[PDB]
Design a binder for this molecule. Sequence first.
Ligand code: NI
Lengths: 15, 453
Amino acid sequence: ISEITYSDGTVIASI
Amino acid sequence: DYLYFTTLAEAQERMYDYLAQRDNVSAKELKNEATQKFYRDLAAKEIENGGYKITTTIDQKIHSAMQSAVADYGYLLDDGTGRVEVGNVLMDNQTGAILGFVGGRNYQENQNNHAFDTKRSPASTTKPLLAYGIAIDQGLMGSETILSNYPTNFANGNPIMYANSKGTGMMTLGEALNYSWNIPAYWTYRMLRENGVDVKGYMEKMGYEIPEYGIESLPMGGGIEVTVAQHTNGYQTLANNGVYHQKHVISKIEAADGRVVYEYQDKPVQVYSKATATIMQGLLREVLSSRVTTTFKSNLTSLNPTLANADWIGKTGTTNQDENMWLMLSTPRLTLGGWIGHDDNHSLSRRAGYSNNSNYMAHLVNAIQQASPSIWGNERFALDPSVVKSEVLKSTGQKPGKVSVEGKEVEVTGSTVTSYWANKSGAPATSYRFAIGGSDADYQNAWSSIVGS
Ligand code: NI
């Protein structure tokens, strides 16, 4: 799974 | 939302670049449409499968606060012309990092991203960047330089208008910007053209794409259309003492096995001199404080007086038929761009930018601050010490001196003022054509007034 995160590492979305 | 797609698209834009180097070191074939798709498809496939960690610049509390702000206060933008659409981008001035944005009123009912994708004339917000900032940067004017706002026509013979006014007379740069008069701006860009200034170079260095520079209404936004994110980056440049940092939402891409396939490096670019940028900062402060073209500082004061006292600078814009309103805002630390309008280009109300966008954005500014209290900052803009100070006549914007006015030497004197320049020697001595622009008839009128000493 690829993750996109906010600047603080909190995940925005999994691809 | 917009967040997923904005973020995913730049991340997969970075992978594209990475791969066209890894999976090929690709030729000018990179201008081929089939190679373009191939690497796009590959970049997409890479991210789906490669177990990548994509670190964005988005601040979670701030962005979320911005989404709440438009949800709660977007209605302030509506004036009878429809559900007015909106785009906002909040940018760290020292890095070009985009910390949060507003893509529009409601993603579910309109998918257009008004922060990043939609392109519209910057209108009068073009002026500080394309005309005045460049002219100052080239030693062609200083802070108290006089420009003509006398009636003049475009080459095609139509009058340069401002609302219903055909113009007035001579005025300072400060006055020209606070009111956003159009004629002074026309004359400024015309002077840059006439003197072969590489305006294209400046704009392209900030990432602006403009197809034709040979256009008289260019400083007024004619023949330009820009995204909010890009236009925010231009104001970041002025805010950050003339130093451009490229806009971005992705700071890093790490592969599953640890490695860094992309990472932000700071590549500052000094687009305007610090003297120029700092002088412009002081001009744009008065644009907001004067309240001629925007109720912003009042609106903000009523919400949060202490935040109203941060050092706000900015510029307003409104297209000819009121189809686009813009308000660009900076503190030393952050720039927040704002556009409102309709996707189908219907006219807004005449006070839509003066009042509604201003009030809405004051709410947005406050929401951002409640989400991150220190973030706007208490730093103040200040003149760079490289700035040259010239005592000049208020009437001419140039140093006191003698001039011939239809025969007869006149010793030109009167009340003076400190004018700020970004050249080496500052202001010149006064000459007959003391101002930027003006016909011989204009100058007969102007010198008559002066000569009434
Ligand atoms: Ni409509």
